[PDB]
Structure formats: structure tokens, C-alpha cells
Symmetry: D2
Subunit: 254 residues, 4 copies
């Protein structure tokens, strides 16, 4: 039960976004939700998707996590509009498409740093600004993939950006733990989303889960959202620096 | 919300048992609970502890997990008495004082195999018997410690037993996943219980957690119970073969 | 260069044994070698295989690692025959055939404990006895598989015994470190040997390595042997409690 | 024996550099060595240091790894001057001093990306250029630290850069494995070097190893160099995407 909680959900682009499965679950559990987006198209999609939620007010903020001032001012505006928050769900990554197929060793410096900036560093600065709204403690969760732990074909520069994110989670957990802020990751199995369309071989990744993972099926956004509700709530009070795989068991097999 | 769910909880000895933390949480959430014990003194404690619970009926079965027949007959009786179950919490381990409190390289064969048998093999046979009561699926959770992942001073034979149990969890997850049974572990931080008396230097282990773990505090049995509630319920659909550290973040630091 | 070093190699059965790859390499580097075996037939193979090696004398001892007396008396006799040794290569495991295929949840208690006894505990008692012949320090290496780290189809009871071995390696490393004895594992990739005939689906495991592993080829016993020379020698003096995968990179991908 | 092998060693600053331990070992084993340095100081210094080696000639190239041109042109020139190479030792990392103490959550975007660029991406572009000089295969080794696997006090931005670097090794292993180029890391224990002075609390880190690591002592640059010789030679054929801890066993304990 999350009535009287407030969470900031970063990274809804459309009805297939992982962050939207999180939103549906939290919403259904009674939470107040604030949404951040980059592209105008994503705000338009949030406005339509909010008609499916039970949020009596639209709280939408444009935050491009490449910009310190947009992250700083965005959270400062959120604090002014809704007061203190209980957590942040971070569902944000980016890499140029030519870096999500072919040969990893041909990755450009600009593409490698782009992916690090948006997919990893953004959690650091978000945590720094979000903590200002969590004087009593809180919970920050980011979304990762098994390609941060193992080399997977095609995931290439984003695998190295997820390894960076997963370490970023541990270091933030150590730093913010004395402030009663927990920081954790969910390592989601493959899910058809707008960003999946850029990963080479994505359909064969999905098929392999169905054939080989312990549950012999793929997961969906709402399953990620249910684990998010656990990590964002008091149920997980003793848990920080942790990476929970929501992937039908695929992480545990070879 | 666990109304209309039934769970078997194995390994309450007294009010400090981790499994009683689990019981309290599941009870508060509306579950029907069934309890298994070894020593007659454990049954007496269970009888006194059930007064604190909302359980309208006492469902108590003696199962020494060294005996196949006791596990077989105990789960069969549980089925005839309460019907199908939704999961099992396994909170059982044992090792001799004499092997524990000597150099690891001095561990006796008998003591090594005793600790495997009770602390690891018991999950396998329990899973096999409990699956007969879970025709539509279920969840099985066992309780481990960071000593199964790293060599910790003094934990000695029980660290090898915990590594065995953590691998047992992954193999059971692979085997039983197509039956929609999930199998997971909770890696609890140190907690003062009857069995902790067995571990040398236990007080300095507690003190290290306070000084060094991200949350700068120790965890308690109810925190283990809240993560158990997540693992045993539909909130962790899609999570199997996982090991969730309820340990203030200690696993993530060095 | 291992002239003036002496190593005990445990677990040659025939010319395909992983331990015979280790023997050839160590022999080619000038080490003096002592061999232990269980079955008469293995002693006969060792007698034949020694004609290929540069050892000027056969040091052969029957040690069934299920027997404490055989391990104690065998190492005692080794020390009386060749003096102090520089390390031990352990290449011993066993499980009953029915436990290397089908459903893990059906594993018998006696089969689970049998595999633990031979494949894990044996290392502990061997280290205890071998330490008496290494008063200046030494190196002990055991042979594991990725199935001890992940659930692998069919490997079943041996995967849990290997997770146990791997923890045994870390706990021995911690215990024996102050005596200047290093203890490490090599995680070998699949290799056609007599014991491979017990693993269901073995040929499929081999084909997956050629298709998926970074080197796109399988490894052989001599490559294990070369990593064994590294771990048994001063070249690895800083390295203990480690598990080195000699598996064409397969451990690193998913 | 590395006679008739040529290795490029990147990252000698002075007599305490880890890469100078590597050079000593490879030089002694008969390898021809080429050296790269960033700033002038490291030149002058290199010129002097190399009188301690048996290199008949001084092959020194200025390469600042922030510059694509310098990496591309530097490897090109090494190929013209010396011909094909057998491997590359990468011993290069950098972060701003302020980012190696205090609160990780305060790290600037500029500081985080600088550490990623120099300490992780540099391996990718180095590997791409160096491949051109390894048409029959070779071996690339980078130097990492346990702070890339766990959150360590103070190490902060560099911990996230080393996590990135360790994933970089695996993705390069997968990519370059079919060209018979292996890529691996050495995770060195703490060692007093010029870069160590920047790391907050370094002396406390060192003391902890002596007190708690299995070998109860610290490691040195030459021990890193001996494991580098293993990784760079045919002894480690079959080993790729691996991270070998030369740290007195500290990684294996908690
Ligand atoms: N789909 C999967 O199988 C899978 C599996 C594991 C993990 N993940 C992770 O889950 C997360 C969500 O991805 P998704 O699959 O749900 O795809 P998605 O719907 O495309 O979500 C990606 C989000 O990233 C945002 N974003 C990119 N750059 C940004 C920037 N500079 N500033 C602020 N927002 C930015 C996008 O916003 P705009 O569209 O407004 O630009 C979009 O809302 C990502 O971290 C992804 O790596 C996905
Ligand atoms: N305390 C901690 O710091 C800690 C941390 C991580 C993990 N754990 C784990 O948590 C679990 C519970 O331990 P605890 O600390 O709660 O100690 P506990 O209160 O002493 O519970 C241990 C239980 O194991 C049972 N048991 C032992 N052998 C048995 C057998 N042959 N058949 C049936 N039951 C048997 C005992 O039953 P009887 O008394 O009836 O014999 C007792 O109920 C164990 O797996 C333990 O390793 C403990
Ligand atoms: N082949 C692979 O793909 C692979 C991969 C990774 C790891 N491994 C491991 O490598 C090691 C060697 O196996 P292998 O593949 O080389 O097969 P192998 O040639 O069949 O060697 C197995 C050895 O185990 C010995 N052994 C079994 N029980 C024993 C006992 N009670 N006491 C003394 N020795 C006993 C056997 O001796 P007797 O025949 O005399 O009984 C035999 O010499 C094992 O630990 C295995 O798990 C194998
Ligand atoms: N010492 C330790 O305890 C320890 C432990 C684990 C891992 N490591 C790692 O070992 C490696 C070597 O460090 P070290 O401790 O040997 O210290 P070091 O002697 O200071 O070596 C660091 C080297 O990095 C070079 N470097 C920095 N930025 C560069 C750039 N942009 N282009 C080219 N070179 C650049 C420096 O060259 P200039 O001096 O010319 O600036 C210096 O030679 C690093 O990867 C470090 O993280 C060190
Ligand atoms: C293979 C599974 C997967 C993982 C992801 O991280 C993912 O999301 C991204 C992948 C690449 C770039 N930006 C993203 F958001 C999509 C995906 F489909
Ligand atoms: C150090 C933390 C800890 C872990 C345990 O597994 C634990 O439980 C046991 C420890 C040893 C033997 N039987 C047990 F049940 C107690 C403990 F105190
Ligand atoms: C699949 C790879 C593999 C691993 C082994 O541990 C192995 O060796 C055994 C496998 C099962 C039982 N005893 C053994 F010695 C054979 C093998 F082929
Ligand atoms: C704590 C151990 C350690 C690790 C390092 O990576 C290290 O080297 C650097 C540390 C930080 C920045 N640049 C470096 F080269 C020094 C160090 F002393
Ligand atoms: N190479 C295709 C992969 C097709 C698939 O999803 O399997 C792509 O670039 O998406
Ligand atoms: N070895 C002591 C432990 C002392 C402590 O708790 O620190 C014991 O017998 O329990
Ligand atoms: N020689 C193979 C025969 C494979 C087959 O034809 O069954 C064996 O050892 O089983
Ligand atoms: N079921 C066969 C598998 C055939 C193979 O792939 O080796 C076995 O038991 O060996």
C-alpha cells in the first residue's frame, strides 16, 4: 500500500515503456506519481496514458538528463509542486543505433561517452538532486540488463554502459545509505519496447528466453513494475546495492 | 495480500528464529500458516508463539529433514490436512560445534556431510515433496548467508554448505520452473538467534555491519520476513533462481 | 621452469583424463610427479602413460578419497618416498549416472552426499594431509566446471557438488594462506573424457562452445595443463582463492 | 619464454608503475618491448628506467589516449618501426583528485566522463588499432581493481570506470576472439604508486590487506608482471574475458 507516497518516474515514451508498467503498478497501489520526459512526443504520450491511471493531477516535467540545469531545475520544481518524495524510478538509456550491432571494437569515443552520459551518469546526478527531496530517506531504482554482467551479442556499447550503471548503483548505495536512501537495480529480461527496436537480433534474444529460461516464457513491463513496488516500498527496507533479475530465471542458467 | 494463500514454514525454534519473522509478516498479511519442527522443545515454543499470531488453528508437524520418510509423510499429511499450498519457507541448517570451532582444513568428513545433508540436500527433497501440493505453481524460499559466496572467518563448513544450498536453489529453479514453481534464496545479514551462538566471533560480525554496511545498521528477522512475503507472493512473478541480500547492503561493499 | 619441484597429481584414469594433460605439461617443464589412482585399471593406464613422460621413476599410490585412512597413509607414504612436495593437482569427482540427466528435484540423498564426499570434501582432507609435506608453502589446484556457478541442463547433482568445491577452495585459501599455501580452481570447458560420458547432452554442450564462445572452439586437456603450470608455480604467487576459466571465454558471455 | 615476442606496454610513469613491473618480467623472459607514455616527464623517466632492462633499443611513443589521432598514428608507427606484435599491456587510468575522496553522489559530469574516457574507452580504441598489428592473433591485458566489482570507500568515480573497463574486456573478448585475440584483466591489490597517492584512504586500504587477506601480505608490481606474462603468453591459451585477481586472495573473502 503506497497511499501517501510520491514517486518520480523517469523515462516513459509510450504504452510499451518499462516505466509505464511501473507507473500502472504504483498507481494501482495508491501512490502519487510525477513523470519526467525528454521529447515532446513523450509528453503527448504521457498525457494520453494518464487517462488510464487514477492520478487526479498531471505532474509532467521535461528533463533531458544530458543537461545539469534541467535535472537540477526539474527536481527543484518537482519539490515546489509536490513537496518531498519517497523515491525515483530511473528508466532511461540511449545509444546510437550503429553501436547496438556489428563489432564492439569499432565503437566511436563520442558514441561510447554518449551512452555512459545518458545511461549511467544520469543516475548519479538524479540521485544527488532527488536526495534533496528525501530528507527522511527514500528509494531509487534503475533498470538494467544482463548485458551489463556478461557480453551479449549486439548489445555492445550499452553492455558497457549497464556495467557502469550497476557499479553506479553500488557506489550510490554506499554513499546515500547513511541518509536512509536505498539504491537498487532491476535487471529486466527482454521486452518489446521502442528502444528494443534498436538492439540487433532482439527477436532471437526473446526466443532464447522462451526456450531456455527456467520459466520458459518472457516477462512483461508489469512484472518489472511489481518488483519496482517492492524495491520502492518498505517491503525491501533491508535491501540496498542489490540487482534483482526479473527475467524468468535466465540470469541463473548457462 | 495473502488471504486464501497457505504456506509451510520450516525451522522455527523460538521467538528469535528468522522463520518467526517470516511467520509474523505472512500472518499479518492474512496467510494460513503450517509449521514444521524437529525438537519437541521447538513445538512447545511454536505453541506459545501461535498465541501472538492470527492463526485460528495450529498446524504443527514434526519433520526432521535427515529422514526421507519424515519429509514424505509430513508433506503428505499436510496435503490431507490443509489441501494444496502456495509455497514453502526453508529456514533450516545445522553444523557441529566441533567442526565449526576448528580450522576449516580440519573439518571431519562426517561433519561436512552432516552440514550438507541438513542445510542443502533438505531443500531438494522438500521441493520434491512440496511440489505435489502445488499443481498450479508456487514459490519456495531458502535462507542463506554471504559466507556461501565468500570465505568468512569462522563460518567454515557452513559456508561450503551455503554455497551448495545456493547452487541447489538455481538447479531447482531450472528444474521446477516449467511447473511454475519459483525457487529463490534470501541472504540474510547476521541476526542474534540460537544458531548464531554456533558461529565464532559473531559479535564482531554484527559490529562490522554497523560500521561498514551502506545502511550502517543491522537487519532483523521481520525485514527478512518482508522480503520473504515479496518472494512468496505474485509480486515476484518473473523472479526465480535469485538470491536477494537483506543485509543493509553489506554484500555490495569491500 | 619446474625442475626440483615435485607435484602430486590425483585423478588420471586414462590418456583423455584432464589430469594427464596436466601431467604432460608439468613433466615437459621438468617437475618430478607422483600419481594417485583409485581403480586397478587406472594404475595400469598410468603404467602405460608414464612411457610417454620423462619421469625416470614411477611414483604411484592408490588413494580412494572416500577413505580417510587411504588419504592419510597415502600422503604419509608419499612424504617418506619423495620428501616435501610443492603442490597437488586434484582432478577427482564422481556421481551416479542417473544424477547427470533428467530432473534434479529427484536426486537421492545418498547420491547427493556421494557426489559431495568424492567431489568436494576430498579436497579438504587432501589439503590437510598434503600441508604436512609443504612446510615452506605450496599450491593446490582443483578442477571445476561452470555448472558450479550456473544451473546447466543435465549436470544436476554435480553442479551442486562443484559449487561446494568452489567454496571449499575459497575457505581453504583463507585457512592455509598464512601457511603460504595457495588454493585455486581451474574451471575447464567441456572436454571428451571418460567422465563426460555421464553428462546427458554432452555433445550439445561441446557444439554450443564452438558456436557461441569468444574463441569459437573447444579447449583441450593440455590447455588446462598450461594454466595448471601457472597456478602451481611461482608465476601465480599473488593469486589464491581464484577460479580461472579455461573455457574459450564461454563463462563471460550470455 | 618470450623470445621473438613483441609487446606494447602502455602506462609507465616511473619506477613504481605497475607497468614497469610488467616490463621487468617480460624483459627478463626475453620479449622485445615497445613503450607508450603520455607526457614528457614520463619520457625522460622512461629513457632512464630502460637502462635497467636488456632492451637493445628504446622504442618509445607518445600516446595520449584521449586523442584518436595519437592512438591511431602511434600504433601505425609502431607497426612500421617494429612490425607485428603479440600483445598489449594497458596500464592507464585517470580521474580528477576531488573525485577520489568524499561523496560519490557529488561527482561532476565532466569528472565522470573523463574517467570513463581515459580508463575504459581507451582500451576499446587501443584494441581496434593494435588488432591491425596482430593478424595471427595476440593477447591484450588491462589493469583493474576490486573497486570495479564492489563499492570501496573513496575510489568512487574510478570504481564506476573500472566496472566499465571490466565489461569492456568481456565485450572485446567476444568481438576479437574469432581473430584469435584474447582480452583479459588483472585485478591488482593495492600497490604504492604515483596514482595511488590520489586515492583517498590508500594507507588504510593497504593495511586491511595485510590484516585480512588470505596471504596476510600485500602484492607488488612484479607479481602483477608475472601474471601478465601468463596472460600475454601461450600458457593462457583458451583463457579470455577473464579477470585474474593478484591481490593476496582478498577478493575471495568478506
Ligand atoms: N526493453 C528491454 O528489453 C530492456 C531490458 C532491460 C533493461 N531495459 C532498460 O529499460 C529502460 C527503459 O527502456 P525501455 O525498453 O522502456 O524503452 P523506451 O520506452 O524507449 O524508454 C527509454 C526512455 O529513455 C529516455 N531517454 C533517452 N535519452 C534521454 C535523455 N537524454 N534524457 C531523458 N530521457 C532520455 C526516452 O525518453 P524520450 O523518448 O523522451 O527521448 C525514453 O522514455 C532503459 O534503461 C533500458 O536500457 C530495457
Ligand atoms: N542468524 C543469522 O545471522 C543467519 C544469517 C543468515 C542465514 N541464517 C540461516 O537462517 C536459517 C535459520 O537459522 P536461525 O538463525 O533462525 O537459527 P534458529 O532459530 O536456530 O533456527 C534453526 C532451525 O533449524 C532447524 N533444524 C536444524 N536441523 C534440523 C533438522 N535435521 N530437521 C529439521 N529442522 C532442523 C532447527 O530446528 P530444531 O531446533 O527443532 O532442531 C531450528 O528450527 C538457517 O538456514 C541459517 O543458516 C541465519
Ligand atoms: N571432462 C570435462 O569436460 C570436465 C570439465 C570441467 C571439469 N571436469 C572435472 O575434471 C576432473 C577430472 O575428470 P575428467 O573429465 O578428467 O574425467 P576422468 O578421466 O574420468 O577422471 C576422473 C577421475 O576421478 C577419479 N575418482 C573418482 N572417484 C574417486 C575416488 N573415490 N577416489 C579417487 N579418485 C576418484 C577417477 O579415478 P578411477 O577411474 O580410478 O576411479 C578418475 O581418475 C573432475 O573433477 C571433473 O568434474 C571435467
Ligand atoms: N597502484 C594500484 O594499487 C592499482 C591497483 C589496481 C589497479 N591499478 C591500475 O593500474 C594502472 C596503472 O596505475 P599505477 O598505479 O601503475 O600508477 P601510475 O604509475 O601512475 O600509472 C598510471 C599511468 O596512466 C597514464 N595515463 C593517465 N592518463 C593518460 C592518458 N590520457 N593517456 C596516456 N596515459 C595516461 C599515466 O601517464 P602520465 O603519468 O604521463 O600522466 C601513468 O603512466 C591503472 O589502470 C590503475 O587504475 C592500480
Ligand atoms: C536486449 C534487451 C534490451 C535491453 C535494453 O537496455 C534496452 O534498452 C536500450 C537498449 C539500447 C539503447 N537504449 C535502450 F534504452 C532494450 C532491450 F531490448
Ligand atoms: C554469521 C551469520 C549466521 C549465518 C548462519 O547460517 C547462521 O545459522 C547457522 C550457523 C551455523 C549452523 N547452523 C545455522 F543455522 C547463524 C548466523 F549467525
Ligand atoms: C559438462 C562438462 C563436464 C564437467 C565435469 O565435471 C565432468 O566430470 C564429471 C562429471 C560428472 C561426474 N563426474 C565427473 F568427473 C565431465 C564433463 F564433461
Ligand atoms: C586503491 C587501489 C588503487 C587502484 C587504482 O586504480 C589506482 O590507480 C588509479 C586510481 C585512481 C585514478 N587513476 C589511477 F591510475 C591506484 C590505487 F591505489
Ligand atoms: N539483424 C536484425 C535482427 C532481426 C531480429 O530481431 O532477429 C536487426 O538488425 O534487427
Ligand atoms: N569465539 C567467540 C566469539 C567472541 C565474539 O563474539 O566476538 C565465541 O566463542 O563465540
Ligand atoms: N564411441 C562413442 C559412440 C557414439 C555412438 O555412436 O553412440 C561412445 O563412446 O559412445
Ligand atoms: N540424450 C543423449 C544426448 C546426445 C548428445 O547430445 O550427446 C545422452 O544421454 O547423451
Amino acid at each position: 500500500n503506497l497511499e501517501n507516497k510520491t514517486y518520480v518516474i523517469m523515462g516513459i515514451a509510450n504504452k510499451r515503456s518499462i516505466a509505464f508498467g511501473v507507473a500502472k503498478v504504483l498507481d494501482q497501489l495508491g501512490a502519487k506519481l510525477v513523470f519526467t520526459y525528454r521529447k515532446e512526443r513523450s509528453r503527448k504520450e504521457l498525457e494520453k496514458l494518464l487517462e488510464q491511471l487514477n492520478q487526479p493531477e498531471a505532474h509532467l516535467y521535461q528533463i533531458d538528463v544530458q543537461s545539469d540545469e534541467e535535472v537540477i531545475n526539474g527536481f527543484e520544481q518537482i519539490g515546489k509542486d509536490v513537496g518531498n518524495i519517497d523515491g525515483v524510478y530511473h528508466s532511461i538509456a540511449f545509444a546510437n543505433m550503429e553501436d547496438l550491432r556489428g563489432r564492439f571494437s569499432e565503437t566511436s569515443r563520442e558514441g561510447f561517452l554518449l551512452a555512459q552520459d545518458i545511461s549511467s551518469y544520469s543516475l548519479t546526478i538524479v540521485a544527488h538532486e532527488a536526495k534533496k527531496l528525501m530528507p527522511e530517506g527514500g528509494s531509487i531504482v534503475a533498470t538494467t540488463y544482463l548485458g551489463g554482467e556478461f557480453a551479449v551479442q549486439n548489445y555492445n556499447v550499452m553492455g558497457v554502459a549497464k556495467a557502469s550503471l550497476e557499479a553506479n548503483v553500488k557506489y550510490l548505495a554506499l554513499d546515500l545509505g547513511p541518509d536512509n536512501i536505498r539504491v537498487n537495480a532491476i535487471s529486466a529480461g527482454p521486452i518489446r519496447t521502442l528502444s528494443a527496436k534498436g538492439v540487433g537480433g532482439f527477436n532471437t534474444i526473446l526466443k532464447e528466453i522462451e526456450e531456455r529460461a527456467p520459466l520458459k516464457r518472457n516477462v512483461d513491463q508489469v512484472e518489472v513494475g511489481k518488483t519496482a513496488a517492492y524495491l520502492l516500498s518498505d517491503l525491501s527496507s533491508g535491501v540496498t546495492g542489490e540487482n534483482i533479475h526479473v527475467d524468468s530465471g535466465f540470469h541463473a542458467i548457462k
